[PDB]
Write a protein that binds this ligand. Structure first.
Ligand SMILES: NC(=O)C1=CN([C@@H]2O[C@H](COP(=O)(O)OP(=O)(O)OC[C@H]3O[C@@H](n4cnc5c(N)ncnc54)[C@H](OP(=O)(O)O)[C@@H]3O)[C@@H](O)[C@H]2O)C=CC1
Ligand SMILES: [Zn+2]
Lengths: 125, 86, 297, 460, 115, 96, 208
């Protein structure tokens, strides 16, 4: 009732993806960086998978942005790094993993602004 | 036949590179005085066996493993490479 | 290379190939295939037509939006030819007619119009010109058709020294006159034919456009196999399951195809000519309601 | 510094900083932020050759590659040379090195000068910021020699200012009294002050002696002058005296060098010869200009009818004197490896594709190698990076900064030659803000940088 | 461990048995498909296409993937036999209108940035 | 303020016109090129500057709810005039 | 609350909680979790092996008799080891109540067909197979129902591109409609709309 087969998962032959969109692609597994224009951090909570950028050219009519790859807008969301790595592996995609960047904790002291002898004393407020 | 450069790749903390570390620290300076014009590139590996590369004329390259070699062993390897004898 | 003419994309419908081609005689048999091949790779095609637009309607889906432009013209006015070939870097001459009319005989169609087109293209700065003549064209031919073809070839070479001359031999295809003319009869043993496939000729024209060193060369587009006319007609009738054009066309079909060993052919353009046996059923299935003919080589 | 490139419909829109605590925290320099305007002007989009009139004309990739390959096959050995610019990635560098090695040419040079005496580039710590950018926050005394950190490395100077403000860091400088946005001690200007400190007469030697985490920084601008070997030897003597007197605090790595261009460290790791002295000593008949726009070598320094190939992305001082122009890709148009002044390897990503017929640099070199019959083993980017790992394995560790310290060996090897110091004041190339905006081909083609230069030159 | 629920095949032998049955059925069907759809290809080239489509998946070592592929191929055969497809669906296996993409490095370098 | 390119084509208010060597001009052969004859920049340049004796005033484009969002413009600077960021109307204090 | 806020119904909430406890007690072999949402919707999470027993019990039991299968579909969550969750929506006319049953599966594990319990499931399972690639065992005739003949891939998977891989046009040379790789004249514009400054504190996750 159970096969108990030892082999890594591979579903490339079942997904219907063309041959040249499997071996030549390079997905990036990363936590997106915070938009430095804003202080919110709610967009740096999950892991993202994105594909490598391909050619975009100008349409001779309308000058619009034309593309020839179907994976230019495909972005996946994952809870953990391991989930993204497993999904990339079982789909036969070569991947690059970037470790999550966390802002290190810092020491803040409002009283350090009005310092008696240190350089941290502010000239205005 | 003319040797062009030598590259030594040793890992910083692995025990397989202990002999190469000792060789460098003790006598790389003397080897460099002996060959002031020969570039000996020392680089660091990671979770890889120590290796030595020799580049010859017209881009010919050969590599030898220095794993678990003592300082004397990698030394003798370098005189073998420099003199051209096998 | 005029950045707007720098190729982009992956050679598809919405790509850019850097080719701006003016195809004279694009409303005919070879013209539809030429325009289809030009438009499937994303090139700008100017289609000049003297005929009613309804008869050019079938060329519209052969290219992406804005890539096929239609303009009226006539062969007796140089201004129309000029305004059609101003912005093109490739000019293709496919104008021809197998019979004479009260307004155009063989001379205007095969000498005057090609010469005017070549002169106007030279004056307009067109980079490449491809002119189509016949394989059996020569000055001393009994038929005025081939004499006019030879004179027009000479005048095109004189006006446009870097023109590419292509000389096919009895093109066969779905809308091709040659397969159809023989099967619509519902002589021989002394005349020899070497027909060529339509797709082969269209791809040869496209590759000559692509080829950089095929500027002032002359090509002869012929098929793989060479047939006696009696056996060829017998094979045609066998494929069609059937029991076995005033004066010029009968003379042309009664004379044997020439051999031009020194003239480069389709093999030099990286094309393997397709045998008639593979496409004969495709062409002649509609004439209905296996023993290929013997060849001489 | 880590950045974010904003693109829309295949066009670069703006540059945003990307947070990295160890390198740039949250900030980028003004040049980094606003020089992307130069990526849309003076661009090389098609291959070019010389016609019968001696002018540059457009040609196909095949013709230009064949013309270069014929000259490459005609000459071999010392007659073939290459110069690498300030914006070249490790992939193109290793590709060019392999291609010229197949020709038996070792004259692979960079425009930036580093003293080759003693260890040279053999020991990696001899030309690195061994303390790292984050390590500045732990130092108590820092000495800057012959450099202007404010303009040469704005984020390094920002880190120094932060340490000065928060850790009460003591700063001293030898050179021109430039404004660094913090107070420092101007020990003087003459290079003999280095010898005085190393001997022990200067009080700053004792100040360094009392320091628990001393740090000495020498800029490559000070190495660009003819006294580079002597200046490096003096700074190494100071560091060795510090180590001998204060003892071994641990893995502190007092010795440091601050680099100014993004391609120098990777080229030195790959075995490129720093400086252009080899070209002057042995003029070539075929010269490769891989993005070299420094003007170090002109046609006056080359023999008659020398063949010059320029590969790059901008039309600048290096382009008009070339015989064949190969349009390359900028840093925003390729996935390329760069190694910073710390020795940390980082990779860019493709934001937009190169314009026109421009191609990836290593792809151009590999295609040229195939045309000449000297086909290179690699075919994809992964194989190029495998070759990089074969040559220098640290080039594939994409966030590692740790490395072995070989200060003793380099210091001992630096005592062989005894070149004398000249009596010329240390003057950094960037003296005021006006010299900071225009440094490279991308910056020189930027209208925003021109506006900044105009504003600082005359103000309203 | 790595115990999984079977679909049809417990091991590889019976999975290959189903593969061979599907191949037999397709091989038998090729001439009827060629005649009934009035295709311009020959029976030999249709069987060559069937063989090529079967060989594209020769690397699979998972019996579950193998029997899912067999299920998909049997659906394909059911579509072909019942004439639910038209001639375009059958001819889509041959890519006659697609210009060939060269494989060598130089051609890809010349055409564009696509590796 | 429609200008004419040296080729002969009208230059639109965005300033674009096909170059002499541009093949894309062929689309206008036997046809015409749509150019809007009313240039907004000139039309707003013809509007006289309003004189108001107030330090801060508001502009909503006229028509009340049929205009643009109401914004307040400071008129302390005498070197230049205050301009609405939505409508382009200019305002100025009565100097002297 | 105020007239802009949807009112709550505690009686229906209690009734649904009691019936969820009842069903969970009767079938402890398959039921893994029972939930009642704030808008009074009851969900029962079961093991995949219990699809037929649980559905048969819910259809045939005197106190349940959910005689109507409202909808059957799948949801794709790539981050889970079991990629797909199967959702059954049932309606009871006798007690005027609705219930939801969820299970899970991956690309290679078949799910037992429920056509013997509900005849309506025949086309729903075909649609699930067509759009997600989930195989249903012992189905009367499982085949594509929505996509074109010969279509490769399962479009409703998250990693399937929006515009697909191939596009159709008429070719005059071959006198038929052909398929070619997709090439957009204008690429679809991807919009980054998700804002920082998290909106709903009640759903905040532990920072792990
Ligand atoms: N067996 C063959 O078909 C081979 C053809 N030849 C040559 O190859 C070329 C293409 O042949 P093919 O396509 O089969 O011939 P078609 O009759 O099918 O097409 C002839 C084209 O030329 C145009 N044309 C003809 N006469 C005039 C005219 N007086 N003014 C303007 N346009 C005109 C037609 O337009 P419209 O529809 O308005 O009449 C039409 O577009 C021709 O030059 C032909 O002579 C080469 C060897 C044999
Ligand atoms: Zn207003």
């Amino acid at each position: 009732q159970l096969i108990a087969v030892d082999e890594k998962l591979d579903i490339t032959t079942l997904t219907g993806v063309p041959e040249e969109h499997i071996k030549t692609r390079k997905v990036r597994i990363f936590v997106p960086a915070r938009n430095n224009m804003q202080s919110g951090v709610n967009n740096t909570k999950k892991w993202k998978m994105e594909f490598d950028t391909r050619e975009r050219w100008e349409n001779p009519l309308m000058g619009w942005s034309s593309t020839a790859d179907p994976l230019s807008n495909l972005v996946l969301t994952f809870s953990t790094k391991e989930d993204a790595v497993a999904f990339a592996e079982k789909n036969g995609w070569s991947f690059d993993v970037e470790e999550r960047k966390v802002p290190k904790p810092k020491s803040k002291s409002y009283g350090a602004n009005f310092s008696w002898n240190k350089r941290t004393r502010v000239s205005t407020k | 036949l003319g040797l062009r450069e030598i590259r030594i790749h040793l890992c910083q903390r692995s025990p397989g590179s202990q002999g190469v570390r000792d060789f460098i620290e003790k006598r790389y300076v003397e080897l460099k005085k002996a060959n002031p014009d020969l570039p000996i590139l020392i680089r660091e590996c990671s979770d890889v066996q120590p290796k030595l590369w020799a580049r010859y004329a017209f881009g010919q390259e050969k590599n030898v493993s220095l794993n678990n070699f003592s300082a004397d062993q990698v030394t003798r390897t370098l005189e073998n490479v420099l003199s051209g004898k096998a | 290379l005029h950045h707007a003419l720098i190729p982009h994309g992956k050679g598809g419908r919405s790509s850019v190939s850097g080719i701006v081609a003016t195809v004279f005689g694009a409303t005919g048999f070879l013209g539809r295939y030429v325009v289809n091949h030009l438009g499937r790779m994303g090139s700008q095609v100017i289609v000049p037509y003297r005929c009613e637009p309804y008869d050019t309607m079938h060329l519209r889906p052969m290219g992406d939006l804005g890539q096929i432009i239609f303009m009226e013209w006539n062969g007796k006015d140089k201004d129309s030819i000029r305004k059609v070939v101003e912005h093109s870097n490739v000019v293709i001459n496919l104008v021809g007619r197998e019979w004479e009319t009260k307004n155009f005989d063989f001379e205007d169609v095969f000498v005057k119009i090609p010469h005017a087109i070549a002169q106007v293209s030279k004056e307009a700065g067109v980079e490449k010109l491809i002119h189509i003549s016949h394989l059996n064209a020569d000055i001393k031919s009994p038929s005025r058709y081939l004499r006019s073809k030879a004179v027009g070839e000479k005048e095109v070479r004189a006006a446009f020294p870097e023109a590419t001359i292509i000389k096919p031999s009895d093109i066969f295809g779905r809308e091709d006159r040659f397969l159809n003319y023989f099967a619509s009869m519902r002589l021989g043993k002394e005349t020899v034919k070497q027909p060529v496939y339509i797709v082969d000729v269209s791809k040869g024209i496209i590759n000559a456009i692509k080829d950089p060193d095929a500027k002032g060369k002359t090509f002869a587009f012929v098929g793989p196999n060479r047939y006696l006319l009696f056996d060829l007609v017998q094979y045609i009738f066998a494929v069609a399951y059937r029991p076995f054009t005033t004066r010029d066309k009968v003379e042309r079909v009664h004379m044997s195809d020439m051999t031009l060993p020194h003239l480069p052919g389709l093999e030099d353009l990286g094309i393997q000519a397709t045998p008639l046996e593979l496409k004969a059923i495709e062409v002649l299935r509609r004439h209905r309601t296996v023993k290929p003919a013997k060849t001489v080589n | 510094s880590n950045i974010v490139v904003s693109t829309r419909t295949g066009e670069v829109m703006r540059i945003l900083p990307r947070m990295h605590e160890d390198i740039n925290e949250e900030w980028i320099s003004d040049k980094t932020r606003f020089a992307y305007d130069g990526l849309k002007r003076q661009r090389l989009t098609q291959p070019m050759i010389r016609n019968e009139k001696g002018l540059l004309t457009y040609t196909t990739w095949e013709d230009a590659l064949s013309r270069v390959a014929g000259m490459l096959q005609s000459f071999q050995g010392n007659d073939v040379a290459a110069i690498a610019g300030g914006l070249v990635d490790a992939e193109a560098l290793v590709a060019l090195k392999d291609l010229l090695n197949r020709v038996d040419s070792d004259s692979l040079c960079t425009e930036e000068v580093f003293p080759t005496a003693g260890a040279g580039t053999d020991l990696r710590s001899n030309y690195l910021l061994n303390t790292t950018i984050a390590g500045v926050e732990e130092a108590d005394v820092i000495l800057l020699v012959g450099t202007n950190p404010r303009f040469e490395a704005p984020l390094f100077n920002a880190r120094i200012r932060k340490s000065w403000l928060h850790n009460d860091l003591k700063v001293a400088l030898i050179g021109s009294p430039v404004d660094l946005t913090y107070r420092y001690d101007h020990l003087g200007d003459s290079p003999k002050i280095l010898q005085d400190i190393a001997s022990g007469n200067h009080p700053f030697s004792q100040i360094l002696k009392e320091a628990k985490k001393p740090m000495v920084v020498l800029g490559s601008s000070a190495l660009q002058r003819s006294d580079g070997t002597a200046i490096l030897a003096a700074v190494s003597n100071i560091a060795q005296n510090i180590r001998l007197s204060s003892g071994v605090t641990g893995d502190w790595k007092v010795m440091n060098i601050l680099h100014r261009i993004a391609s120098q460290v990777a080229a030195l790791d790959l075995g490129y010869k720093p400086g252009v002295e080899a070209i002057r000593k042995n003029p070539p008949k075929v010269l490769f200009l891989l993005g070299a726009d420094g003007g170090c070598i002109t046609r006056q320094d080359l023999p008659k009818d020398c063949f010059i190939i320029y590969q790059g992305h901008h039309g600048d001082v290096g382009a008009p004197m070339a015989d064949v122009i190969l349009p390359g890709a900028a840093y925003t148009e390729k996935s390329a490896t760069y190694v910073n002044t710390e020795g940390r390897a980082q990779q860019t990503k493709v934001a937009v594709t190169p314009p026109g017929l421009a191609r990836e640099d290593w792809k151009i070199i590999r295609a040229l190698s195939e045309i000449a019959g000297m086909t290179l083993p690699y075919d994809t980017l992964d194989q190029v990076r495998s070759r990089l790992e074969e040559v220098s394995p640290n080039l594939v560790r994409y966030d590692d900064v740790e490395g072995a310290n070989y200060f003793q060996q380099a210091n001992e090897l630096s005592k062989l030659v005894n070149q004398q110091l000249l009596a010329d004041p240390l003057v950094p190339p960037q003296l005021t803000i006006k010299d900071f905006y225009m440094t490279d081909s991308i910056s020189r083609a930027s209208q925003t940088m021109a506006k900044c230069v105009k504003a600082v030159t005359e103000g309203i | 461990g790595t115990s999984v629920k079977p679909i049809f095949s417990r091991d590889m032998n019976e999975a290959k048995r189903r593969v061979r049955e599907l191949y037999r059925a397709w091989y038998r069907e090729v001439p009827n498909t060629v005649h009934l759809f009035q295709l311009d290809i020959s029976v030999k080239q249709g069987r060559d296409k069937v063989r090529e489509m079967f060989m594209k998946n020769a690397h699979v070592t998972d019996p579950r993937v193998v029997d899912l592929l067999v299920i998909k191929g049997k659906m394909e055969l059911e579509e072909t036999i019942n004439v639910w497809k038209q001639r375009t669906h059958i001819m889509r296996f041959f890519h006659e209108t697609e210009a060939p993409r060269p494989t060598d490095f130089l051609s890809k370098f010349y055409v564009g940035h696509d590796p | 303020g429609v200008r004419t390119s040296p080729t002969g084509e009208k230059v639109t208010h965005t300033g674009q016109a096909y170059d002499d060597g541009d093949y894309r001009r062929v689309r206008f052969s036997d046809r015409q090129k749509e150019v809007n004859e009313n240039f907004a920049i000139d039309l707003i340049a013809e509007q006289p500057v309003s004189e108001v004796g107030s330090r801060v005033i508001s502009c909503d484009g006229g028509g009340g709810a049929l205009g643009h969002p109401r914004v307040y413009i400071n008129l302390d600077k005498e070197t230049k005039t205050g301009t609405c960021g939505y409508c382009g109307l200019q305002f100025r204090q009565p100097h002297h | 609350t105020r007239p802009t806020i949807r009112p709550r119904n505690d009686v229906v909430h209690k009734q649904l909680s009691a019936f969820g406890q009842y069903v969970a007690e009767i079938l402890p072999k398959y039921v893994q979790q029972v939930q009642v949402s704030c808008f009074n919707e009851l969900e029962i999470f079961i093991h995949p092996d219990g699809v037929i027993p649980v559905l048969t019990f819910l259809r045939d039991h005197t106190n349940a008799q959910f005689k109507s299968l409202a909808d059957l579909t799948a949801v794709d969550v790539p981050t889970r080891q079991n990629r797909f969750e199967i959702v059954y929506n049932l309606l009871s006319l006798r007690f005027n109540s609705r219930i939801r049953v969820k299970t899970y599966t991956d690309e290679l594990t078949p799910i037992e067909s429920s056509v013997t319990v509900y005849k309506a499931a025949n086309w729903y399972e075909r649609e699930i197979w067509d759009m997600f690639g989930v195989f249903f065992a012992n189905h009367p005739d499982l085949r594509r129902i929505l996509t074109d003949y010969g279509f490769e891939g399962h479009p409703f998977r998250k990693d399937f591109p929006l515009s697909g891989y191939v596009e159709l046009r008429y070719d005059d040379e071959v006198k038929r409609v052909v398929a070619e790789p997709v090439e957009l004249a204008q690429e679809f514009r991807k919009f980054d709309l998700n804002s920082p400054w998290e909106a709903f504190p009640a759903y905040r996750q532990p920072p792990e």
